[PDB]
């Protein structure tokens, strides 16, 4: 209702429309290349700003601040693994995907192994992962932030948001979305820094957070419900390792071997094998512009511990009877969720610490985060479906019908998400951020295991790669089905899930499943006859500098990934510096 | 002290990147 809020929300919309219009007036969207891969024309700053803005959603604000309040600062684990794995993207994987001349990541595996069946399998698994683990978190976290900050209807508001990100997606393609994401990253970081400032002022500095957080317990620890009674001191007092990234390897909530290995594995699928991030790396002007943007994204991916996790911990210090509630009656009154109220942490700092003018800015921040992520998913799924599935059904399709089918898939994936919104609203509290990271740790390691063997081990053949993926879905589905069967409960109400299934952290099962998919792929590969090198040029990390005539199991200016040695020198030295800073910060909080 | 933990982390990291330059210099050429 404030003049200022409304003006700040429409200045944001004027920026987004302004840069959209400039981009469509510049770029060509009458071709598949242009509409789907920005004409292969993006420079370092669009690539990195896009990689950041395509990743950071409303779920980062709601999830990381929620978990920061709940469990302290080891969820920075999620964001900081990425520094190391975005170096992998540039220096190891994108070299190979730029010489392969692929538009989709299923197409790479078609070129590398050569069946009809791996490319179709990967497309259908990818599309379901985007429904379950990427769209669901954005709809859920949007609904938290609208319910708390605004108090609007969380059905109508999600429809209206999903509808305007539909129009923003179909209207210009990757080009528009990338150049716009350079605005949306500025808006996200700007408003997030302003809220960090107010929060750290309220608790009385950085020193204030680290001398007040461990004391931040609720004073309402006794229930009116029989067979609950006195809530345990384990589950309302803050965790006594709350200021340490590296937690105990058997009893930690995030064990350190699980953090470092298991997140490197699942992050490897997310950053290096996944169409949503890798389409930002197939639209670059040159490999040196891809490596430069990898570094911008990676320095930007430090920011989330200081802009979401610590704010959420400051939220538990300031509203301990509302953010750290444990009694069911109290949690039903505070946030409508019997199982806890961590999720209101960021939403509540915004609705209590921000003045008349800047509340509008923080609405612009969450809108920018949510719009950028949903648009990146709707475009990447458009490409995935159109290029892979629609060219199986109609081979002689051609670059006009394909754009029509690309824009009609965005409409379909919006309507499917609208239909899926009540299911995701059935997830109760901060359980959902454990569900999404668990489903990721059960489905993705088989895909990580194939792409590392498809890229680094040229002995691996099509039978190996396919039975690797299906053996993995089988092992993974074991954990998923028996878990979802007993639900989660809370610390107050432990589930009856037998411990051997549960008690192994899902990031540890990520590691076992990766090595089991790897071993199966290698074993079936080594029994069956190999793929010779005449089939493999410029599609394996060994052969990315080949010049020899490949024979397809399925112009030359994209094949060339030679960079200027001066500019190579510069991106190589900034990568080592960026790693050194990441390693220093992991040391500081370990 | 946190600052010492940070610097030991960086020190072991510069040791590992010196090992990477050693291994590829003697084993790729
Ligand atoms: C307890 C869990 O709580 C949380 C875990 C993560 C997040 C933030 C988040 C991170 C990611 C990404 O996850 C991938 S791995 C799939 C990483 O590589 C990447 O750096 C992350 O940005 C995806 C969704 C979300 Cl909601 C919030 C709560
Ligand atoms: C329902 C129940 O067990 N209530 C107990 C109460 O009997 C006891 O006096 C108090 C002492 O801390 O702890 C609580
Ligand atoms: Na985003």
XYZ file of C-alpha atoms and ligand atoms in Angstrom:
662
model
C 0.000 0.000 0.000
C 3.043 2.435 0.273
C 3.674 4.870 -2.615
C 7.371 3.980 -2.436
C 6.914 0.181 -2.515
C 4.641 0.412 -5.591
C 7.055 2.782 -7.467
C 10.087 0.501 -6.626
C 8.158 -2.551 -7.903
C 7.391 -0.781 -11.250
C 10.949 0.627 -11.710
C 12.024 -3.061 -11.516
C 9.429 -4.034 -14.173
C 10.573 -1.099 -16.406
C 14.209 -2.392 -16.195
C 13.102 -5.966 -17.090
C 10.876 -4.810 -20.046
C 13.628 -2.265 -21.115
C 16.443 -4.861 -21.372
C 14.068 -7.458 -22.915
C 13.079 -4.948 -25.649
C 16.747 -3.947 -26.286
C 17.718 -7.658 -26.619
C 14.874 -8.610 -29.030
C 15.625 -5.422 -31.108
C 19.322 -6.635 -31.275
C 19.223 -10.506 -31.699
C 17.647 -12.892 -34.337
C 14.931 -15.298 -32.965
C 13.697 -16.587 -36.382
C 16.308 -19.441 -36.222
C 16.818 -22.401 -33.800
C 20.401 -21.279 -33.166
C 19.302 -17.789 -32.217
C 16.195 -18.583 -30.152
C 17.775 -21.571 -28.370
C 21.525 -20.664 -28.065
C 21.664 -16.830 -28.288
C 23.362 -17.214 -31.723
C 26.470 -18.414 -29.825
C 27.253 -14.757 -29.041
C 27.366 -14.069 -25.271
C 30.356 -12.578 -23.470
C 31.727 -13.225 -20.046
C 29.426 -10.971 -17.958
C 26.101 -12.236 -19.457
C 27.375 -15.884 -19.049
C 28.292 -15.481 -15.399
C 25.397 -13.294 -14.358
C 23.057 -15.797 -16.086
C 24.685 -18.776 -14.375
C 24.214 -17.060 -11.017
C 20.668 -15.818 -11.643
C 19.556 -19.109 -13.231
C 20.708 -20.911 -10.019
C 19.618 -18.585 -7.132
C 15.818 -18.761 -6.634
C 13.254 -17.900 -3.985
C 14.215 -21.336 -2.562
C 17.730 -20.054 -1.706
C 16.307 -17.193 0.362
C 13.615 -19.432 2.001
C 15.712 -22.681 2.246
C 19.204 -21.455 3.180
C 17.976 -18.857 5.771
C 15.482 -21.457 7.147
C 18.230 -24.086 7.533
C 20.618 -21.376 8.823
C 18.169 -20.601 11.628
C 17.544 -24.312 12.248
C 21.063 -25.850 12.120
C 23.688 -23.000 11.783
C 26.104 -22.390 8.891
C 26.955 -25.777 7.100
C 24.284 -25.237 4.414
C 26.866 -22.794 2.948
C 28.258 -26.223 1.944
C 25.695 -26.263 -0.927
C 26.819 -22.924 -2.435
C 30.541 -23.263 -1.821
C 30.896 -26.661 -3.483
C 29.886 -24.853 -6.610
C 33.104 -22.742 -6.779
C 35.106 -25.904 -7.451
C 32.554 -27.450 -9.686
C 32.134 -24.332 -11.937
C 35.811 -24.503 -12.610
C 35.104 -28.116 -13.753
C 32.388 -26.809 -16.154
C 34.780 -24.348 -17.908
C 38.075 -26.068 -17.918
C 36.893 -29.683 -18.406
C 33.472 -30.147 -19.805
C 32.744 -27.080 -21.929
C 35.835 -27.463 -24.041
C 34.376 -30.819 -25.029
C 30.735 -29.670 -25.566
C 31.832 -26.711 -27.752
C 33.899 -29.007 -29.997
C 31.021 -31.611 -30.110
C 28.659 -28.946 -31.608
C 25.780 -30.109 -29.399
C 22.675 -27.968 -28.538
C 21.409 -30.420 -25.790
C 23.185 -32.690 -23.271
C 21.214 -35.767 -24.414
C 22.565 -35.002 -27.955
C 26.159 -35.204 -26.631
C 25.486 -38.812 -25.410
C 23.877 -39.613 -28.802
C 27.129 -38.410 -30.527
C 29.420 -40.088 -27.923
C 27.716 -43.580 -27.684
C 25.282 -43.686 -30.621
C 22.109 -45.568 -29.610
C 18.590 -44.131 -30.104
C 17.792 -45.076 -26.440
C 20.243 -43.121 -24.134
C 19.189 -39.698 -25.631
C 15.439 -40.385 -25.085
C 16.037 -41.813 -21.582
C 18.027 -38.761 -20.538
C 15.416 -36.313 -21.899
C 12.525 -37.929 -19.957
C 14.580 -38.221 -16.701
C 15.681 -34.524 -17.136
C 12.097 -33.271 -17.667
C 10.835 -35.096 -14.508
C 13.857 -33.765 -12.479
C 12.863 -30.202 -13.536
C 9.209 -30.817 -12.371
C 10.256 -32.458 -9.022
C 13.460 -30.672 -7.856
C 13.538 -27.229 -9.662
C 9.998 -25.925 -10.396
C 8.598 -27.333 -7.086
C 11.182 -25.490 -4.878
C 10.449 -22.142 -6.697
C 6.613 -22.518 -6.338
C 6.919 -23.661 -2.695
C 9.345 -20.863 -1.604
C 7.366 -18.257 -3.524
C 4.248 -19.402 -1.647
C 6.140 -19.086 1.760
C 7.275 -15.532 0.954
C 3.782 -14.388 -0.361
C 1.970 -16.012 2.664
C 4.238 -14.268 5.212
C 5.289 -10.923 3.650
C 2.151 -10.105 1.584
C -0.696 -12.293 2.904
C -2.237 -12.701 -0.566
C -3.946 -15.936 -1.754
C -1.007 -18.404 -2.412
C -2.927 -20.058 -5.361
C -3.853 -16.889 -7.367
C -0.449 -15.280 -6.751
C 1.550 -18.340 -7.945
C -0.711 -18.499 -11.116
C -0.085 -14.769 -11.830
C 3.754 -15.100 -11.247
C 3.924 -18.333 -13.392
C 1.870 -16.568 -16.140
C 4.154 -13.486 -16.332
C 7.338 -15.708 -16.315
C 5.583 -17.649 -19.206
C 5.365 -14.364 -21.256
C 8.967 -13.297 -20.277
C 10.149 -16.844 -21.392
C 8.291 -17.308 -24.749
C 8.847 -13.621 -25.874
C 12.650 -13.652 -26.652
C 14.690 -16.815 -25.822
C 17.991 -17.356 -24.186
C 19.358 -14.120 -25.499
C 16.805 -11.965 -23.771
C 16.887 -14.131 -20.617
C 20.739 -13.897 -20.300
C 20.996 -10.065 -20.846
C 18.003 -9.601 -18.480
C 19.681 -11.897 -15.927
C 22.487 -9.350 -15.857
C 19.866 -6.861 -14.430
C 18.261 -9.503 -12.167
C 21.649 -10.405 -10.595
C 22.232 -6.655 -9.822
C 18.685 -6.375 -8.227
C 19.176 -9.689 -6.259
C 22.599 -8.732 -4.861
C 21.625 -5.099 -4.176
C 18.524 -5.828 -2.119
C 20.058 -8.855 -0.381
C 23.047 -6.636 0.779
C 20.643 -3.961 2.104
C 18.741 -6.653 4.163
C 22.045 -8.186 5.400
C 22.896 -4.646 6.622
C 19.709 -4.056 8.591
C 19.928 -7.582 10.116
C 23.578 -7.275 11.219
C 22.746 -3.764 12.632
C 19.826 -5.252 14.682
C 21.919 -8.033 16.442
C 24.840 -5.503 16.783
C 27.410 -6.533 14.155
C 29.193 -9.706 13.053
C 30.493 -10.124 16.648
C 26.843 -9.950 17.851
C 25.752 -12.930 15.681
C 28.509 -15.270 17.016
C 27.996 -14.449 20.766
C 24.116 -14.542 20.694
C 23.243 -17.462 18.353
C 23.991 -20.453 20.645
C 21.763 -18.878 23.362
C 18.823 -18.427 20.909
C 16.361 -21.047 22.370
C 12.532 -20.735 22.650
C 10.993 -20.449 26.178
C 7.845 -22.507 25.159
C 9.127 -26.161 25.432
C 6.112 -27.991 27.108
C 3.073 -29.332 25.121
C -0.691 -29.474 25.972
C -0.814 -32.806 23.962
C -0.473 -36.142 25.875
C 2.300 -38.513 24.569
C 4.475 -35.433 23.667
C 4.975 -33.652 27.064
C 8.383 -31.956 27.686
C 10.210 -31.367 24.331
C 13.815 -32.780 24.539
C 16.715 -30.288 25.168
C 18.411 -31.783 22.032
C 15.651 -30.306 19.719
C 14.943 -26.706 21.041
C 18.559 -25.752 22.045
C 20.762 -24.709 19.043
C 23.238 -27.360 17.783
C 26.544 -26.990 19.645
C 28.518 -27.344 16.300
C 26.367 -24.530 14.690
C 29.370 -22.270 13.779
C 31.345 -25.111 12.038
C 31.015 -26.124 8.292
C 32.898 -29.418 8.891
C 30.570 -31.434 11.240
C 31.071 -34.948 12.711
C 31.353 -37.717 10.071
C 28.855 -40.161 11.762
C 26.591 -37.880 13.958
C 26.688 -34.514 12.095
C 23.504 -33.267 10.424
C 25.802 -32.582 7.398
C 28.783 -34.951 7.762
C 31.984 -33.444 6.253
C 32.776 -36.438 3.903
C 29.162 -36.348 2.706
C 29.483 -32.480 2.173
C 32.786 -32.610 0.220
C 32.421 -35.847 -1.906
C 28.634 -36.248 -2.094
C 27.942 -32.606 -2.970
C 30.839 -32.594 -5.498
C 29.044 -35.584 -7.189
C 25.517 -34.069 -7.174
C 26.901 -30.557 -7.990
C 28.721 -32.206 -10.903
C 25.342 -33.281 -12.424
C 23.806 -29.851 -11.632
C 26.613 -27.684 -13.091
C 28.372 -29.912 -15.662
C 25.743 -32.420 -17.045
C 22.506 -30.476 -16.863
C 20.832 -28.535 -19.694
C 19.732 -25.590 -17.466
C 23.309 -24.460 -16.552
C 25.099 -25.859 -19.667
C 22.864 -23.909 -22.157
C 24.491 -20.724 -20.648
C 27.877 -22.348 -21.651
C 26.803 -23.261 -25.244
C 25.727 -19.631 -25.957
C 29.169 -18.047 -25.242
C 31.154 -16.182 -27.954
C 34.332 -18.193 -27.127
C 35.723 -20.734 -24.623
C 37.754 -17.894 -22.980
C 34.424 -15.976 -22.431
C 32.994 -19.204 -20.881
C 35.978 -19.564 -18.489
C 35.703 -15.826 -17.505
C 31.973 -16.254 -16.673
C 32.681 -19.386 -14.720
C 34.883 -17.220 -12.476
C 32.250 -14.420 -12.178
C 29.620 -16.991 -11.137
C 32.043 -18.632 -8.703
C 33.022 -15.434 -6.899
C 29.305 -14.553 -6.766
C 28.490 -18.026 -5.216
C 30.392 -17.013 -1.970
C 27.862 -14.309 -1.362
C 24.968 -16.664 -0.297
C 26.518 -17.561 3.073
C 26.831 -13.969 3.943
C 23.448 -12.896 2.355
C 21.019 -15.783 3.254
C 22.518 -18.163 5.912
C 23.782 -15.519 8.394
C 20.566 -13.418 8.007
C 18.603 -16.525 8.892
C 20.763 -17.147 11.982
C 20.207 -13.409 12.939
C 16.471 -14.170 12.492
C 16.658 -16.974 15.096
C 18.355 -14.520 17.580
C 15.701 -11.811 17.010
C 12.465 -13.946 16.927
C 13.407 -17.102 18.929
C 9.784 -17.766 20.156
C 8.564 -17.618 16.438
C 11.563 -18.877 14.343
C 12.795 -21.518 16.896
C 9.297 -22.823 18.038
C 9.139 -26.609 18.798
C 5.618 -27.093 20.375
C 3.029 -28.260 17.791
C 0.251 -25.905 19.111
C 2.702 -22.943 18.953
C 3.970 -23.855 15.437
C 0.326 -24.301 14.228
C -0.401 -20.717 15.532
C 2.900 -19.135 14.178
C 3.250 -20.513 10.567
C 0.384 -23.115 10.118
C 2.966 -25.981 10.076
C 2.843 -28.291 13.137
C 6.409 -29.625 12.358
C 8.357 -26.268 12.744
C 8.658 -22.572 11.522
C 12.220 -22.075 10.184
C 10.838 -21.071 6.707
C 9.470 -17.706 8.021
C 13.053 -16.727 9.004
C 13.841 -14.661 5.864
C 10.208 -13.695 5.216
C 10.016 -12.346 8.876
C 13.247 -10.325 8.832
C 11.850 -8.621 5.682
C 8.415 -7.886 7.170
C 9.913 -6.542 10.514
C 13.326 -4.832 9.702
C 12.718 -2.946 6.402
C 11.396 0.673 6.242
C 8.492 2.058 4.097
C 10.568 2.232 0.851
C 12.810 -0.900 0.841
C 10.058 -3.522 1.562
C 9.173 -3.000 -2.173
C 12.881 -3.599 -3.055
C 12.873 -6.942 -1.138
C 9.653 -7.947 -3.035
C 11.651 -7.024 -6.230
C 14.497 -9.268 -4.965
C 12.288 -12.356 -4.473
C 10.462 -11.691 -7.787
C 13.853 -11.331 -9.589
C 15.166 -14.608 -8.064
C 11.920 -16.574 -8.858
C 11.462 -15.149 -12.414
C 15.113 -15.764 -13.433
C 15.071 -19.412 -12.222
C 11.624 -20.383 -13.636
C 12.439 -18.774 -17.016
C 15.802 -20.635 -17.195
C 13.965 -23.945 -16.472
C 11.103 -23.267 -18.974
C 13.607 -22.297 -21.749
C 15.950 -25.282 -21.077
C 13.038 -27.744 -20.943
C 11.714 -26.143 -24.199
C 15.057 -26.964 -25.878
C 15.277 -30.416 -24.353
C 11.755 -31.443 -25.514
C 11.836 -29.663 -28.939
C 15.374 -30.712 -30.102
C 15.308 -34.319 -28.557
C 11.659 -35.583 -28.449
C 9.936 -33.562 -31.244
C 12.696 -34.349 -33.774
C 12.222 -38.099 -32.994
C 8.465 -37.833 -33.847
C 9.050 -35.487 -36.897
C 12.586 -35.683 -38.454
C 12.027 -33.267 -41.463
C 10.874 -30.525 -39.052
C 12.947 -27.414 -39.874
C 13.730 -24.188 -38.055
C 10.209 -22.534 -38.061
C 7.936 -25.415 -36.828
C 10.579 -26.142 -34.140
C 10.235 -22.565 -32.725
C 6.447 -22.902 -32.642
C 6.758 -26.250 -30.760
C 9.387 -24.665 -28.461
C 6.960 -21.856 -27.466
C 3.999 -24.285 -27.081
C 6.051 -26.522 -24.702
C 6.608 -23.465 -22.400
C 2.797 -23.075 -22.187
C 2.455 -26.816 -21.427
C 5.190 -26.903 -18.685
C 3.488 -23.838 -17.013
C 0.075 -25.642 -16.988
C 1.685 -28.912 -15.611
C 3.361 -26.856 -12.791
C -0.035 -25.183 -11.964
C -1.507 -28.728 -11.693
C 1.506 -29.846 -9.497
C 1.252 -26.791 -7.111
C -1.180 -28.464 -4.606
C 1.112 -31.538 -4.244
C 4.122 -29.350 -3.394
C 1.861 -27.340 -0.929
C 1.215 -30.728 0.827
C 4.944 -30.686 1.996
C 4.964 -29.324 5.488
C 7.717 -26.924 6.553
C 11.456 -27.251 5.963
C 11.074 -31.036 5.147
C 10.765 -29.987 1.444
C 14.391 -28.724 1.239
C 15.460 -32.158 2.663
C 13.171 -33.919 0.064
C 14.596 -32.031 -2.962
C 18.272 -32.552 -1.960
C 17.480 -36.243 -1.241
C 15.734 -36.833 -4.653
C 18.792 -35.116 -6.276
C 21.165 -37.470 -4.323
C 19.111 -40.546 -5.508
C 18.619 -39.752 -9.253
C 21.605 -37.574 -10.340
C 24.702 -39.685 -9.362
C 24.060 -42.226 -12.196
C 24.000 -39.273 -14.654
C 27.197 -37.782 -13.080
C 28.754 -41.310 -13.352
C 28.024 -41.598 -17.130
C 29.139 -38.070 -18.137
C 32.539 -38.446 -16.300
C 33.046 -41.847 -18.094
C 31.605 -40.462 -21.389
C 34.085 -37.573 -21.280
C 37.287 -39.037 -19.662
C 37.266 -42.868 -20.421
C 36.913 -43.579 -24.185
C 36.671 -47.411 -23.601
C 33.073 -46.975 -22.209
C 30.509 -47.903 -24.939
C 26.702 -47.561 -25.410
C 25.632 -50.824 -23.610
C 27.784 -49.796 -20.630
C 26.380 -46.240 -20.506
C 22.771 -47.356 -20.851
C 22.859 -50.191 -18.250
C 24.852 -47.793 -16.020
C 21.929 -45.295 -16.040
C 19.156 -47.986 -15.623
C 21.117 -49.903 -12.870
C 21.408 -46.533 -11.108
C 17.685 -45.680 -11.428
C 17.032 -49.111 -9.885
C 19.364 -48.628 -6.888
C 18.235 -45.045 -6.408
C 14.529 -45.839 -6.587
C 15.181 -48.374 -3.750
C 16.014 -45.559 -1.334
C 13.379 -43.109 -2.718
C 10.418 -45.505 -2.499
C 11.091 -46.966 0.929
C 11.827 -43.430 2.303
C 8.721 -41.614 0.997
C 6.837 -44.663 2.430
C 7.545 -43.703 6.127
C 7.621 -39.902 5.615
C 9.902 -37.606 7.737
C 8.158 -36.359 10.925
C 10.451 -34.041 12.997
C 12.974 -34.138 15.922
C 9.880 -33.981 18.225
C 8.034 -36.804 16.323
C 10.686 -39.164 14.846
C 9.398 -41.256 11.882
C 9.418 -45.081 12.092
C 11.702 -45.384 9.045
C 14.021 -48.324 9.820
C 17.506 -46.782 10.487
C 19.636 -48.650 7.897
C 17.533 -46.909 5.192
C 17.449 -43.416 6.779
C 20.514 -43.232 9.175
C 22.898 -43.266 6.175
C 22.870 -39.529 5.147
C 21.456 -39.113 1.575
C 24.825 -37.425 0.562
C 26.586 -40.690 1.595
C 24.186 -42.773 -0.536
C 25.069 -40.282 -3.412
C 28.718 -41.475 -3.130
C 27.870 -45.232 -2.972
C 25.411 -44.925 -5.900
C 27.963 -42.995 -8.035
C 30.649 -45.710 -7.546
C 28.058 -48.488 -8.132
C 26.829 -46.857 -11.449
C 30.480 -46.304 -12.431
C 31.442 -49.912 -11.659
C 28.390 -51.306 -13.562
C 29.033 -49.009 -16.616
C 32.748 -50.003 -16.700
C 31.914 -53.736 -16.195
C 29.256 -53.936 -18.984
C 31.551 -51.757 -21.192
C 34.555 -54.051 -20.630
C 32.554 -57.259 -21.473
C 31.031 -55.812 -24.755
C 33.082 -54.739 -27.883
C 34.443 -51.118 -27.904
C 33.832 -47.923 -30.025
C 36.903 -47.194 -32.249
C 38.582 -43.702 -32.382
C 37.300 -42.841 -35.942
C 33.824 -42.615 -34.193
C 35.097 -40.392 -31.277
C 37.018 -37.244 -32.483
C 36.210 -33.935 -30.689
C 33.721 -35.738 -28.334
C 36.145 -37.014 -25.613
C 38.438 -34.814 -23.431
C 41.537 -36.645 -24.945
C 40.425 -35.808 -28.562
C 39.062 -32.201 -28.145
C 42.069 -31.095 -30.329
C 41.852 -33.612 -33.212
C 41.443 -32.047 -36.751
C 40.705 -35.706 -38.009
C 37.454 -36.682 -39.824
C 35.006 -38.167 -37.243
C 32.591 -40.897 -38.469
C 29.168 -40.118 -36.896
C 27.547 -42.977 -34.874
C 24.551 -40.621 -35.539
C 30.557 -24.659 -39.195
C 34.299 -25.443 -38.439
C 34.563 -22.032 -36.550
C 32.614 -23.609 -33.577
C 34.913 -26.749 -33.738
C 37.958 -24.467 -32.884
C 38.501 -23.907 -29.085
C 42.030 -22.352 -29.368
C 42.193 -19.166 -27.194
C 44.714 -16.255 -27.330
C 47.508 -17.331 -24.895
C 47.490 -13.842 -23.128
C 43.715 -14.120 -22.356
C 44.170 -17.820 -21.474
C 46.936 -16.701 -19.038
C 44.503 -14.233 -17.390
C 41.502 -16.696 -16.908
C 43.971 -19.425 -15.708
C 45.460 -17.090 -13.011
C 42.021 -15.746 -11.892
C 40.798 -19.382 -11.481
C 43.683 -20.181 -9.086
C 43.082 -16.988 -7.117
C 39.290 -17.751 -6.922
C 40.132 -21.306 -5.661
C 42.595 -19.842 -3.082
C 39.883 -17.465 -1.709
C 37.293 -20.321 -1.628
C 39.796 -22.570 0.245
C 40.666 -19.736 2.713
C 36.910 -19.212 3.488
C 36.357 -23.019 3.909
C 39.315 -22.992 6.359
C 37.942 -19.963 8.280
C 34.537 -21.685 9.044
C 35.737 -25.386 9.159
C 42.180 -19.008 15.681
C 40.101 -19.032 12.391
C 42.698 -17.010 10.359
C 45.370 -19.754 10.924
C 42.843 -22.451 9.756
C 42.246 -20.378 6.586
C 45.993 -19.906 5.865
C 46.806 -23.652 6.529
C 43.955 -24.500 4.046
C 45.494 -22.172 1.378
C 49.041 -23.501 2.138
C 47.965 -27.183 1.580
C 46.044 -25.998 -1.581
C 49.207 -24.314 -3.056
C 51.119 -27.583 -2.199
C 48.471 -29.587 -4.175
C 48.563 -27.204 -7.221
C 52.436 -27.403 -7.161
C 51.973 -31.253 -7.188
C 49.533 -30.887 -10.194
C 52.203 -28.876 -12.133
C 54.836 -31.526 -11.124
C 52.731 -34.574 -12.203
C 51.559 -33.168 -15.632
C 55.124 -31.716 -16.371
C 56.856 -35.148 -15.819
C 53.899 -37.461 -16.944
C 52.053 -35.626 -19.904
C 55.232 -34.502 -21.808
C 19.022 -29.375 4.076
C 18.922 -28.900 2.686
O 18.590 -27.506 2.731
C 18.846 -26.690 1.667
C 19.737 -26.986 0.637
C 19.932 -26.101 -0.394
C 19.256 -24.897 -0.439
C 19.485 -23.943 -1.589
C 19.387 -24.682 -2.908
C 20.538 -25.059 -3.597
C 20.501 -25.757 -4.801
C 21.751 -26.133 -5.558
O 22.025 -27.512 -5.270
C 23.058 -28.058 -6.091
S 23.327 -29.805 -5.763
C 21.733 -30.391 -6.444
C 24.361 -27.324 -5.848
O 25.352 -27.845 -6.712
C 24.164 -25.832 -6.104
O 25.331 -25.115 -5.746
C 23.016 -25.308 -5.262
O 22.820 -23.929 -5.564
C 19.256 -26.101 -5.312
C 18.080 -25.763 -4.643
C 18.165 -25.055 -3.452
Cl 16.714 -24.628 -2.608
C 18.370 -24.608 0.593
C 18.158 -25.488 1.641
C 4.552 -33.900 31.997
C 5.906 -33.931 32.655
O 6.631 -34.906 32.525
N 6.234 -32.825 33.352
C 7.503 -32.601 34.043
C 7.218 -32.178 35.486
O 6.592 -33.265 36.175
C 8.493 -31.772 36.237
O 8.135 -31.188 37.493
C 9.338 -30.793 35.409
C 10.690 -30.516 36.059
O 11.570 -29.917 35.100
O 9.559 -31.322 34.093
C 8.376 -31.558 33.323
Na 17.158 -17.142 -10.110
